[PDB]
Amino acid sequence: SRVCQVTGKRPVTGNNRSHALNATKRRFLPNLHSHRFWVESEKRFVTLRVSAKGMRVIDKKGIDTVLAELRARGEKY
């Protein structure tokens, strides 16, 4: 599914509002990308389905910190 493995960001629903204020149901999808992260501690690359926001979270916290959250959640990588 279109779910960020880091933040949990998923498709949300809302409306397209026209100039005439006609509401039509829509979705806002997360900016998802499958990215290979180098994990020094495991001497292996880990491919995660992450939003650009989640990628910034990994830049701040570090991949080991983020992967530890995935283990605690039971979420495999």
């Binding site: 180098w38 020094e40 990628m55 910034r56 830049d59 701040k60 570090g62």
Partner: protein, 149 residues
């Protein structure tokens, strides 16, 4: 993205320098190949503590080397007995081991490596000047007494 460099990287800086880099350069090249680390408040302290620890350890070594450099000039004349023939020509020579072991027994604990001779290895009876490398910049002189045995 602020990062503190581990190695020497072109156009950026040197080891321990704090530079602003594009997130993708750090993420996909600099951090995986160990050329840099994120400039986090924990690591900025760890690298400033190492900068202060190296500055204090380099100032004390500059203080110990100058105490050694003033002890080398204090002796001013060291006597070395060597078997020399007629006209003053030595059968052997007075090398680095010979000069270094003469000053260690005199007081100043100088190494074989620290001794620096210009052209010869001392093959004549008389007086000669011997310069010393105590540190990369600190230099001090002594006069060697070539006494015939």
């Amino acid at each position: 993205m602020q990062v503190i460099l581990l190695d020497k990287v072109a156009n950026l800086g040197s080891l321990g320098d704090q530079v602003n880099v594009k997130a993708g350069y750090a993420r996909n090249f600099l951090v995986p190949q160990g050329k840099a680390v994120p400039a986090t408040k924990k690591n900025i302290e760890f690298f400033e503590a190492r900068r202060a620890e190296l500055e204090a350890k380099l100032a004390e070594v500059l203080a110990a080397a100058n105490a050694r450099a003033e002890k080398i000039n204090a002796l001013e004349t060291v006597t070395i007995a060597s078997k020399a023939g007629d006209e003053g020509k030595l059968f052997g020579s007075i090398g680095t081991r010979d000069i270094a072991d003469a000053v260690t027994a005199a007081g100043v604990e100088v190494a074989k490596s620290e001794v620096r001779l210009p052209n010869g290895v001392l093959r004549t009876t008389g007086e000669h000047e011997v310069s010393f490398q105590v540190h990369s910049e600190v230099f001090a002189k002594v006069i060697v007494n070539v006494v015939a045995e």
